[PDB]
Amino acid sequence: HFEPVTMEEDEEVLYKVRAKLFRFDADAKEWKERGTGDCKFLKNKKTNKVRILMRRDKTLKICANHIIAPEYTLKPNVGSDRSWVYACTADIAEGEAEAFTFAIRFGSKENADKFKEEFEKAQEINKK
Amino acid sequence: SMEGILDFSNDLDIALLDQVVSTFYQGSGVQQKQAQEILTKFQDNPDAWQKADQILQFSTNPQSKFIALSILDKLITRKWKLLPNDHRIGIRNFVVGMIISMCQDDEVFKTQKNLINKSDLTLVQILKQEWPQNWPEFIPELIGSSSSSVNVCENNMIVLKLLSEEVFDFSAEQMTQAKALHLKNSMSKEFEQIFKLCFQVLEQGSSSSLIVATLESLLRYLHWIPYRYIYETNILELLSTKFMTSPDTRAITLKCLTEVSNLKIPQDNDLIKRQTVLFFQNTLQQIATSVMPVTADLKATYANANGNDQSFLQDLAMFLTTYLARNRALLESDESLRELLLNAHQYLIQLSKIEERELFKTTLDYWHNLVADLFYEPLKKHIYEEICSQLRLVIIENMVRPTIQLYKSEREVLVYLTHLNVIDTEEIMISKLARQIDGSEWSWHNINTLSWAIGSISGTMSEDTEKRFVVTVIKDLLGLCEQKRGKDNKAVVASDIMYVVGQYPRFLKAHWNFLRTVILKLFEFMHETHEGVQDMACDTFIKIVQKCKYHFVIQQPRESEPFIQTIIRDIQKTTADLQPQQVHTFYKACGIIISEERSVAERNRLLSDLMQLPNMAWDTIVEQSTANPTLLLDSETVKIIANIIKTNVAVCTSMGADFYPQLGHIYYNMLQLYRAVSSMISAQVAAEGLIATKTPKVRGLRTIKKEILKLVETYISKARNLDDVVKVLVEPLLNAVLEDYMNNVPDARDAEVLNCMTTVVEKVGHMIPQGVILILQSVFECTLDMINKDFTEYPEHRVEFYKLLKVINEKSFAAFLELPPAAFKLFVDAICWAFKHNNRDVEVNGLQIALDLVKNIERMGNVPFANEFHKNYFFIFVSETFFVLTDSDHKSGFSKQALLLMKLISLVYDNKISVPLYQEAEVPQGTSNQVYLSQYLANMLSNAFPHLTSEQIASFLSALTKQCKDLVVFKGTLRDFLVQIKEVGGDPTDYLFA
Amino acid sequence: NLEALQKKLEELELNQ
Amino acid sequence: VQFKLVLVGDGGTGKTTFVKRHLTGEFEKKYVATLGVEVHPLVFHTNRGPIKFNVWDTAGQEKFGGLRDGYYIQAQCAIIMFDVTSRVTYKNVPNWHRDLVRVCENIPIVLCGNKVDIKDRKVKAKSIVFHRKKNLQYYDISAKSNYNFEKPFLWLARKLIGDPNLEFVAMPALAPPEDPALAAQYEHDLEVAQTTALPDEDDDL
Ligand SMILES: Nc1nc2c(ncn2[C@@H]2O[C@H](COP(=O)(O)OP(=O)(O)NP(=O)(O)O)[C@@H](O)[C@H]2O)c(=O)[nH]1
Ligand SMILES: [Mg+2]
C-alpha cells in the first residue's frame, strides 16, 4: 500500500444562440449595447420555468437575466430584419429587478426567426 | 461648504485644505467628485502659488504638499521670469531649505518618497531657469553637502538623475534649441566632479539605497557622457562583478551594461575591445553562479512569476541581444572565448522558450539578425551549428498562424535556418510528424502549428528534395486523417493537408495529375456542411490558382481541353452549396485563369461562358424589373441583383482591362438600373422620412447602387484603352450619378459617388475637361454644405470630398479657373476648413491641396488671375497656417504646416508675387512685399500672442524669413516659437541659434 | 509513391 | 481587496470609451473630453474571489489636465493608452510614462494600442518597442470590437494578486423574479424604441 499524492447546473439548456443585446436609453433617444455573447434559454428542472441568461464574452458577466414572461411580445425594429425589441419588467443582470426596453440582434434573419420560435415555445412552458 | 478655500480674500484654512485633499484621495462618490472640482479650481487659480509656502510649512497632509509643489511647478515653468526678482530667490531658498529638512528627519526621508521626489523635481525646474548663470556653485555645494548625510548624498543622486533627464532626454521639444544647448554644455563642463562623487559612492558602499540611487543616475549619464569615463576607469569592473551579485543592484546594473553595449567607442583600439569582452564575461559568470545556470528552465521560472524574475529575464534578453548584435564578432575568433559565446546564445535559446509574446519578438529579432549573418558571412555558420539546431525546434514549435508580422519574421528565420542545414530541418519536421501520428504530441493546436512550419519553408529546398519531402508529408498527413475518428478531427487534418499543398506550387506545377486531384477534392469539400471546410476549400482554390494559373489555361498532355473549360462547365454543380461571398471568390479565381489566355477571341469566349449564369439571371430581371419596377421592393430580387453585380465585380477585379467585353454586355442596362433604384430610394424617403435610409429595404437598394459604382471604378482604375473609357463610359456614367447625387437630401447622398468620381478624374481627368467641370458643379457646393457646420457629421463624405478636390487640383486645375468668384472663394474656405480637422485623412489632404494650389498659381506667371489670387488669398493662407501651427490642437500636421508656410514665405522673398500685397493707402508706395510681409506678421502675432514682447516677434520673424530655404532649420525655428509662447519672457536671442 | 499518393488523396472523406 | 488604477494617455486615444465598455457594455461613439479625472469602481470575478479596480480615468487634453500628476499618487497599477491610427499618440507615450513612474516608481503598467479595428493602421506593430526596456506589458486592443479588451485587467490582476494562474470566472446567476397603471408608458417607450434604428447594422452581430 502506497498513499498517492455558477448556479446553473440544476437547469437545462433549451436553446443557445450568439447575439448582441441593447437597452434603450429613453432620455437620450439612443440605443446602448449591454453585451455580446451566448444567449441561452434555461429551464429549471425543479420548476420548469424558462428564463433568459446571457453572459458577456471573456469577462463572463451577465447582461440578461429574466423569465420569458408570457406577457412579453417580440416586435421588429425599423432598421433591422435580424432583431427583436420587447419590454422587460424584471431583469436582474445588474442587481435588483429593473424594467428595460431590450433589443437583441443575431447573425442572420434565420437565427432571429428561430429565436422567435423558441422564445414563444418557452412562453407556453412558463404558462403551465 | 468645501467651496471655502476657493476664496482668496480671506486667509487659507490649512486644516480645511487637508480635509478637501483627503476627501478626494481617500473618499468616494459625489463627495470625492465635489472635492475634485474644487481642488482643480484652487490649483488653477493664478495666485495660488503665493500660498504654497504656507502649505509646505503648515500642512499635515503629504498630498497637500504635493499639490502645492505642482502649483509651484506651473509658476516656475511659465512665469518665472515675470516675477519680481526677490521672490525668485525666496521660492528657491525655500525649496532647498525644505529638501534639507526632509533629509535629516529619517522618518520623513523613508515614508514620504513621493513628496521628496516631487520636491527634487521642483528644484530641477528652478535649475533650468537659473543654473549655472545665477547659481554657479550648485554643483560644488551639492558635492560638498553629500559628505554630510547618507540621506542627503542619496537624494542628491535623485536630483542629478532628474537633471540629466530634463537636459538630455526630454529637452528636445520642451525648451528652445538655445536653452537646451546651454544646459547640455553646462552639465558637460561640470560632469568630471559629478563622476568623481558617483564613482566614490559606488566603490565605498555601503547603503544599498544609496548605491541603487547612484546606479539609476549612472543609467542616465550613459546616454550622453564621453566614452572615456567608462573604459578608462574601473567602473566597468564593479558593474560587471560587485553589483551583479546583489539582487538590489542587479536590475539597474544590467540596464547600465545594456546601455554600455551601445556606447560610441573606437573600433580599432585593442584595449577597449578586451574591455568590451571582459565585462561581458564577468556578467555571464555572475549570472551562472548567483542567479541561474545555463541549463535552467527559464520557461518555468517566467511562468511562476516569483519576485522580479519576469523583469530580470526581460532585462537579460535585452542585454544579451544588444551586446551580441553589436559585439559577437569579438568572441568568434579567439578560441578561449568560444564557450563564452556559446553559453550566451544558449541562454537566449532558453529565453526563447518563454511563453511571452513580446519577449519572444525581442529574441526573434536577434535570431533573425544572427541567421542572416550566417547565411551571408564566410566561415561563421559552423560556429553556431548546435545553437541553430535548437533554434529550428523552438521556431517550429512556436509557429503562429499565417499576427501578420510575427509569422513573416518566423518564416524568414526558419527559411534561413533551412538553407544553413536542409537535412536537419527536414529531420525535425518528420519526427514531429511521427510524434503526431503515434499520439504523444497530438493536438489540434500542435498539428496546425506543425503544418504552418512545414508550409513556411517552401521553395528553400531543391526541387528534387522538396518533391520527396512533400510526398512523405502528404502521405503521413493522409494517414493521420484515416486514423482519426470523427469529422471534428477529420476536418482539422484535412484543412492542414490543404494548407500544405497550397504552399508548394512548384510541386503542384510539375505533377499535373496530382494537381487536378487536389482541385477535384476541394470541389467536393465545397459541399461539406461542416463549418470552416467550405471557406477553407475556397481559399485554397484561389490560392493554388494564383500560383498555377498557367496549368489551367493550357490543355495538359493526355487531356482533351484546358481544365478551365471543365471548371466553367460544371460551375453550377460545383458552387451550388456555397454562400454568395464564396461563389464570388470562385468566380474571381476563374477570372485569374482566364486572364492567362492571351488569344483575344479565346479569352472573350471563356469570359462569356464563365458569366453565363449571372448574365442569364441579369437578362431576366432587366426585362421583368423594367416591366415594371414593383419587383425592386421584393427583398429577394434586390439580393439577387446585388449578387449579380458582385459577381461582376469579383471577375473584373482579377481580369482588369480584359473585362471590358462583359462590361459592355451590361453597361447601359446597369446604369438604367442605377436610375430606377435611385428613384425608389427617393420615393421611400418621401413616403417614410429620413428613417427609411435605415430600413433593410432601402439599405438593400443602396447596396445595388454602391456595387454598381464599385464595378465601374474597378474597371476604370485598371483600363488600358483609355479612349473607350472617355468615349463610351464617362458620358452615360455622369448623366446617371451626378444629378441624382445633387438633388438627393443629404442623408440619401452616397459618398461612394465622390469616390467613383475621384477614380474617373485620376485616370482620364486630363481628357475630360468639361467632364470635370460638370462633376464640380454637381457635388462641390452641396457636399461642402453638408460638412462645414461641424467636424463630425458625414465622416465618409468629408474624406471623399477632399480626395476628389485633391485629384481635381492635380489633374484638371482648369476646372477651378472656370469657377465663379463666389465659388472660388468657397474653394479657398473649404481648403482652410480642412486645416482645422484633427481627422488626419482630411487634414493631410487639406494641406496638400493648399500646397498644390499655390504651385498651380505660381506656374500661371504674371497673369490677372494669379495677381488677384495673391491679393485676395495669400494672407488668408499665411494666417490660417499660422493658426493651426500655434493652437496646440493640430500637432500631427506640423511638418506639412511648416512646408506650406515656407512655400508661402519664400514666394515673397523671391519676388514671385509681382503685384503689391497691400492696398495703395495703408503703406507708402514702392514698399517691397518683404517689408509689408514682416509688418503684417508682426501685427498678427502681436494680437494673437499679446504676452510676447516686440523684440521676440521681430527676432522670430527675422530668423524665419532668412531660413525659408532650409526646412530643417525653419522647422527648428517654429518649434522654438511654439515653446516661447507657452511662457512669459522668452529670450529673443534664442532665434539666432542657427 | 506519386501514383499511390494520388489514390490516397481521392479516398480522403470526412465522414467515416 | 481594492486597487487604484490610473489610466493615462493622449486626448482622444479612447481611455474613457475603454472604461465605459467595461462598466456598462456600451460603446460611446462621441468624443466628450474628460475634465481632470473620472473615478469609477470596476469589479471582476476570479477563481481567487472578486477583485475591484478603482479606475482613475485621467484627461489627455492639456487644456483639461487638472491636477495632472497629482492623480497618480498612491496608484498601484496603470494603463498607458495610445491610438494606433495616430503616430503622435505613440510619440507621447514616453512622456506619459516619465510623469507616471516619477510618482509611482514600481507598479505594474500595461501599454495599450487602441483602435486596431480601423483598417488604416499608422503605428505598425514592428514600431512598438517602448515597453521592452521599461518592462511594460503590451497589448493590441480595440474598445470598438472588444479585441483583447479583457487582457489589460487580467494581466494586472495576476500581478496584484500574485497568482499567474488567476482567471475570470462566471458570476453565480440567481433566479429572476416574475400593474396596468404602468402599461400606459411601457408601450409609449416601446413605440419610440422600435422606431429608433439600432446602431451599426452592417456589423457581424
Ligand atoms: N474605431 C474606434 N474608435 C474608438 C475606439 N475607442 C474609442 N474610439 C473613439 O475615439 C474617440 C475618443 O473617445 P474617448 O474615449 O473619449 O478618448 P479619451 O482618451 O478618453 N479622450 P480624453 O483623454 O480627452 O478624455 C471616440 O469617438 C471613440 O468612439 C476604438 O476602439 N475603435
Ligand atoms: Mg475621456
Task: Count CB-CB contacts under 10 A for residue B429.
Answer: 21
What one-character-per-residue DSSP string does B402-447 give? --HHHHHHHHHHHHHHHHH-HHHHHHHHHHHHHHHHSSSS--HHHH
C-alpha to C-alpha distance for B708 and B720, rounded to whole angstroms:
20
CA B227 to chain centre: 34
CB < 8 Å from D in window 46-85 of A = 49, 51, 53, 55-63, 65-67, 69, 75-80, 83, 85
Ligand 1 neighbours (beta carbon < 6 A): D 9, 11-17, 29-31, 33-34, 59-61, 114-115, 117-118, 142-144
Is residue D16 part of an annotated ligand binding site?
yes
- Cβ atoms of D33 and D27 closer than 8 Å: no
Which residue of chain D has the CA closest to B116?
Answer: D103
Size of interface B-C (CB pairs under 8 A): 41
Q: Using CB atoms, which chains have 3+ pairs under 8 A with A?
A: B, D
- Does residue B856 have a cis peptide bond before it, meaning omega lies within 30 degrees of 0? no
D171 closest CB neighbour out of A21, A62, A99: A62
Residues 62-101 of chain A with CB under 8 A from chain B are 78-81
Q: Which of C1, C9, C10 to mutate to test the interface with B (most CBs of B within 10 A)?
A: C9
Nearest-atom index, ligand 1, CA of D10: 23
Nearest one of D77, D83, D155, D150 to D112, comparing CA atoms: D83
C2 with B497: Cβ contact below 8 A: no
Chain B contact partners (≥3 CB pairs within 8 A): A, C, D
Backbone angles phi, psi at B222, to 5 degrees: -60, -15
**Alpha helices (runs of H) in chain A, residue ranges in sequence order:** 109-125
Q: Residue D46: helix, strand or coil by DSSP? A: strand
Distance D27 CA to ligand 1 centre (A): 9
- Resolution for this PDB entry, in angstroms: 2.5
Ligand 1 centroid from CA B521, angstroms: 48
Atom of ligand 1 nearest to the CA of D13: 19
CA of B726 to the centre of ligand 2 (A): 50
The technique by which this structure was obtained is X-ray
Question: CB count, 10 Å around CB of A13?
Answer: 12
What's the rounded Cα separation, in Å, for the pair B959 and B962? 5
Could you write out the DSSP letters of every residue in B712-772?
HHHHHHH-S-HHHIIIIIIHHHHHHHHHHHHTS-GGG--THHHHHHHHHHHHHGGG-HHHH
Rounded distance, CA D155 to CA D109, Å? 9
- Structural domain count, chain A: 1
Contact A70, D180 (CB under 8 A): no
Q: What is the distance between the alpha carbons of residues D79 and D55, in angstroms, rounded to a whole number?
A: 10
Amino acid at B686: A
Q: Is D11 annotated as belonging to a binding site? A: yes
CA B520 – CA C13 distance, rounded (Å): 12
Q: Report the DSSP beta bridge partners of residue A65.
A: A53
Q: Report CB contact under 8 Å: D126, B405.
A: yes
Domain with residue A20: its CATH number is 2.30.29.30
Cα separation, B547 vs B665, in Å, equals 30
Residue B615 CB coordination number (10 Å)? 17
Q: What type of residue sits at position B291?
A: V
Q: What angle do CA B761, B767, B772 make, to 5 degrees?
A: 45
Name residue, grid cell 499511390: C4
Q: Which residue has the cell 519664400?
A: B906
Give how far Cα B279 sits from Cα of B239, B276, D31, Å.
8, 6, 53
| Best residue among D8, D15, D16, D17 to mutate for probing ligand 1, ranked by most atoms within 8 Å of CB | D17
The residues that bridge with D139 in the sheet, in sequence order, are D112
Residues forming beta bridges with residue A64, ordered by sequence position? A54
Q: Which residues of C touch B490 (CB under 8 A)?
A: 14-15
Instruction: Kindly state whether D169 is in contact with chain A, defined as any CB-CB distance less than 8 angstroms.
Output: yes
Which helix (H) or strand (E) segment is B22 a member of?
A: helix B14-26
In whole angstroms, what is the distance from residue B55 CA to residue B73 CA? Answer: 15
- DSSP state at residue B555: P
Domain range for A21 is 1-128
Q: Label residues D110-144 b or e (16+ Cβ within 10 Å = b).
A: bbbbbbbeeeeebbebeebebbbeebbbbbbbbbb
Domains plus CATH for chain D?
A: 1-205 (3.40.50.300)
Answer whether D25's CB lies under 8 Å from D76's CB.
no
Q: How many residues does chain A have?
A: 128
For residues B287 and D66, what is the distance between their CA atoms, to the nearest angstrom? 46
Is residue D132 within 8 angstroms of chain B, CB to CB? Answer: yes
A&D contacts, CB < 8 Å: 124
DSSP state of B693: G
Which is nearest to B574 in space by CA: B562, B583, B564? Answer: B583
B702 with D202: CB under 8 angstroms? Answer: no
First to last CA, chain C: 24
Tell which of D117, D188, D196, D204 to mutate to test the A interface (max A CBs under 10 Å).
D196
- C-alpha cell recorded at residue D164: 499567474
Contact A91 D189 (CB under 8 A): no
| D31 Cα–ligand 1 center, Å | 6
The residue contributing the CA closest to ligand 1 atom 7 is: D14
Q: How is residue B167 annotated by DSSP?
A: I
Q: Give the Cα separation of A65 and B862 in Å (integer).
A: 77
Backbone angles phi, psi at A16, to 5 degrees: -140, 130
Is D114 annotated as belonging to a binding site?
yes
D28 — contact with chain B (CB < 8 Å)?
no
How many angstroms separate the first and last alpha carbons of chain B? 56
Task: Choose among B792, B702, B714: nearest CA to B741.
Answer: B702
Q: D176 at the B interface (CB within 8 A)?
A: no
Whether residue B468 lies within 8 A of chain A, CB to CB, comes out as no
Q: What is the CA radius of gyration of chain C?
A: 9
Q: What CA–CA distances, in Å, run from B434 to B442, B477, B484, B769?
A: 10, 10, 15, 69
B132 upstream amide cis, omega within 30 of 0: yes
Query: Strand pairing of A30-44 and D77-83?
Result: unpaired
User: Does A110 reach chain B within 8 Å, measured CB to CB?
Assistant: no
Q: How far is CA D111 from CA B892, B953, D2, D140, D143, in A?
A: 21, 41, 21, 9, 14
Question: What is the full DSSP assignment across B52-95?
Answer: HHHHHHH---HHHHHHHHHHHHHHHHHHGGGS-HHHHHHHHHHH
The answer to whether D17 touches D143, Cβ cutoff 8 Å, is: yes
Q: CA-CA distance, B192 to B182, in Å (whole number)?
A: 17
Q: What is the CA radius of gyration of chain A?
A: 17
d(CA A14, CA A40): 7
D-interface mutation test, from A34, A58, A96, most D Cβ less than 10 A away: A58
Q: Which three cell numbers stand for residue B759?
A: 477614380
Q: Do chains B and A touch (3 or more CB pairs under 8 A)?
A: yes
Please list every residue in chain B whose beta carbon sits closer than 8 Å to the beta carbon of residue C15: 487, 490
SS3 A99: strand
Q: How many whole angstroms separate alpha carbon B927 and alpha carbon B525? A: 83
Q: How many CA atoms lie within 13 A of A76 on its CB side?
A: 10
Contact B348, B363 (CB under 8 A): yes
Establish whether D60 is an annotated binding residue.
Answer: yes
Please answer yes or no on whether B514 and C2 come within 8 Å at the CB atom: yes
Task: From chain D, pick out residues whose CB is under 8 angstroms from the CB of B892.
Answer: 86-88
D195 is in an annotated binding site: no
Instruction: Convert B470-498 to b/e letters by CB count within 10 Å (16 or more is b).
Output: bbbbbeebbebbeebeebebbbbbbbbbb
Taking each helix axis from N to C terminus, what angle separates B338-351 and B385-397, rounded to the nearest 10 degrees?
A: 0
Tell whether B405 is within 8 A of chain D (Cβ).
yes
For B:815-844, CB contacts with D below 8 A are 838, 840-841
Determine the distance in angstroms separating the CA of B73 from the nearest CA of chain D, rounded to an integer. Answer: 11
Cell of B350: 532558453
> Is there contact between C and A if contact means ≥3 C-beta pairs under 8 Å?
no
Ion ligand 2: residues, CB < 5 A: D 16, 34
Distance CA B825, CA B872 (A): 9
Listed in sequence order, the residues at least 6 apart from B745 whose beta carbon sits closer than 8 Å to its beta carbon are B685, B690
Contact D70 B63 (CB under 8 A): yes
From the list B362, B337, B360, B356, the residue with the least C-alpha distance to B284 is: B337
Cα B832 from Cα B847, distance rounded (Å): 8
Put simply, the answer to whether D194 touches A75 (Cβ < 8 Å) is: yes
Q: C-alpha angle with apex B358: B356 to B359, nearest 5 degrees?
A: 65
For residue B675, count other CB atoms closer than 10 A to its CB: 14
